[PDB]
Design a protein around this ligand. Structure first.
Ligand SMILES: Nc1ncnc2c1ncn2[C@@H]1O[C@H](COP(=O)(O)OP(=O)(O)OP(=O)(O)O)[C@@H](O)[C@H]1O
Ligand SMILES: [Mg+2]
Lengths: 61, 73
């Protein structure tokens, strides 16, 4: 009986802590992903405007 | 190779330079879109494209030309 509860508690805490550590890491991945996405969106917006200005100029031609 | 950018064509029905592939379908089945896509896709492949529009509606031909122009094709 003693060897069981301890193992459960050992294993259990290794697992809660591990799960929350993973949460942190993701909190990290997402955090990273959000920054990348934001930059990509800005560039894409830039894409649209730039290319449409090119299209304008061609229309003027 | 003559690339269409259509994975269904360029994997299973490949079209090569000097070839004649027919695009056959019903009305409004997507035939023009496939052909037009091919011409739009030769943007930097250094080929010349001709689009003969036999008997096609004047507005429709104009629409195709406008689409090509917007793309820079
Ligand atoms: N890969 C595709 N994905 C989504 N829609 C498509 C695709 N290819 C064609 N279409 C749509 O199908 C519609 C009819 O296509 P399209 O006019 O190109 O075919 P069509 O056979 O030339 O018709 P028509 O007989 O009127 O000339 C178009 O509005 C087009 O947007
Ligand atoms: Mg058509």
């Amino acid at each position: 009986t003693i060897r069981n509860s301890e193992e459960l508690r050992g294993k259990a805490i290794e697992q809660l802590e591990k799960a929350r550590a993973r949460l942190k890491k993701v909190e990290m991945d997402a955090d990273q992903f959000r920054v990348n996405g934001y930059s990509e969106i800005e560039r894409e917006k830039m894409n649209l405007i730039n290319s449409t200005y090119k299209t304008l100029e061609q229309f003027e031609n | 190779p003559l690339q269409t950018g259509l994975i269904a064509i360029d994997a299973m029905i490949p079209v090569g330079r000097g070839q004649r592939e027919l695009i056959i379908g019903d009305r409004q089945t997507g035939k023009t879109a496939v052909a037009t896509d091919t011409i739009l896709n030769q943007q930097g492949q250094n080929v010349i494209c001709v689009y003969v529009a036999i008997g096609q509606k004047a507005s429709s031909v104009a629409q195709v030309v406008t689409n090509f122009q917007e793309r820079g094709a």
